[PDB]
Design a protein around this ligand. Structure first.
Ligand code: 1FZ
Ligand code: MG
Ligand code: NA
Ligand code: NA
Length: 327
DNA sequence: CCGACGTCGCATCAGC
DNA sequence: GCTGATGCGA
DNA sequence: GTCGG
């Protein structure tokens, strides 16, 4: 559907969701509001009452009441009050910095630190991740055009193959599903020398090369299997330079790679469906392996997977392109 | 009534 | 110093 | 906050 259909309601619930996660530290009440926001955003009618909305999965009594108040008054008393609360709004805002969660944002505001400005005059109280998030605060809240993602893929695939041509890299996420834009770049990486029963330098050598050609600009975290950092496309000429982008590089064992590729391709809703259907066919699916359920639920050894299709076969589904995987 | 509500690698903290 | 908990992201 | 055993 469209925005102005129930945008005022979905925005209200989205605001409410954030305050729950960031201020109240109620992660489950955060997901509840977002789930309610989603199902309403799919509802192809301009909602007339809270009761009409209550018919939907995810909308209970409390939200029905709030929807009633919004439709009747055009606003929400509790949300209006919390928007103008100095402490709460500042705590909620500081969490927009990557690295600063609700706990760190709590401490900052507790000791006077309320703003980006305030963060800037207090570098020594920010860890490495928080500094990067502050430095690229604006760039990280921007989306990446698909064309730029394609240019970014060109670089990743080229350099990865350059390090070792037996590497297998795959850009997953919404990009692989064909989205016109992405929020980040999730790269999944494997190599013949890396199985589950199987060096610890495979991920390091790839991150290193991407730093040597100056694609990777910063590093949020890095271990033997997962890399979280920052990257940037080269500036064309005197033309304005590209924003800094979030990139994740994951080293997954060969025998788990395609369960990894399938999982990190998405979408969420699709992964819910596929696993729900997988169970009723007698198989359990996590991000790593596909295992057969016994007659009492006792899972067996993981079944060999050498392609995405292999998984679809196991649960008797026709292999569907990432293009058609929103649900 | 009352627990589930996805899971886990990495950095960094609290404790010993 | 080591181990395990906690915060964070996704 | 919502759902459901
Ligand atoms: C957060 C999350 C991740 N995933 C696995 C599949 C999501 O589609 C996917 C990629 O996560 P993402 O990068 O946060 N979302 P996206 O890549 O589809 O799109 P965008 O780049 O964030 O705009 O990873 C889930 O299956 N359920 C989830 O709730
Ligand atoms: Mg992505
Ligand atoms: Na309901
Ligand atoms: Na944050």
């Amino acid at each position: 559907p469209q925005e102005t259909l129930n945008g005022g309601i979905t925005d209200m619930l989205t605001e409410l969701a954030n305050f729950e996660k960031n201020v109240s530290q109620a992660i489950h009440k955060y997901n509840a509001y977002r789930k309610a926001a989603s199902v309403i955003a799919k509802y192809p009618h301009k909602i007339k009452s809270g009761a009409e909305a209550k018919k939907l999965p995810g909308v209970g009594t409390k939200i029905a009441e709030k929807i009633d108040e919004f439709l009747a008054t055009g606003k929400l008393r509790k949300l209006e009050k919390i928007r103008q609360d100095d402490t709460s709004s500042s705590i909620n805002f500081l969490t927009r910095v990557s690295g600063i969660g609700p706990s760190a944002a709590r401490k900052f505001v507790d000791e006077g630190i309320k703003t980006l400005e305030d963060l800037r005059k207090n570098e020594d109280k920010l860890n490495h991740h928080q500094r990067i998030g502050l430095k690229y605060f604006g760039d990280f809240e921007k989306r990446i055009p698909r064309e730029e993602m394609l240019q970014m893929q060109d670089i990743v695939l080229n350099e990865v193959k350059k390090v070792d041509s037996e590497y297998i890299a795959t850009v997953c996420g919404s990009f692989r599903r064909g989205a016109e834009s992405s929020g980040d770049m999730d790269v999944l990486l494997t190599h013949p020398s890396f199985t589950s029963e199987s060096q610890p330098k495979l991920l390091h050598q790839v991150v290193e090369q991407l730093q040597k050609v100056h694609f990777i600009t910063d590093t949020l975290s890095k271990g033997e299997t997962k890399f979280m950092g920052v990257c940037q496309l080269p500036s064309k000429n005197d033309e304005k330079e590209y924003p800094h982008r979030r990139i994740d590089i994951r080293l997954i064992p060969k025998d788990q790679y395609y369960c990894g590729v399938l999982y990190f391709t998405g979408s969420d809703i699709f992964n819910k469906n596929m696993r729900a259907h997988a169970l009723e066919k007698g198989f359990t699916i996590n991000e790593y392996t596909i295992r057969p359920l016994g007659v009492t639920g006792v899972a067996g050894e993981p079944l060999p997977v050498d392609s995405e299709k292999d998984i679809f076969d196991y649960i008797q589904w026709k292999y569907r392109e990432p293009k058609d995987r929103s649900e």
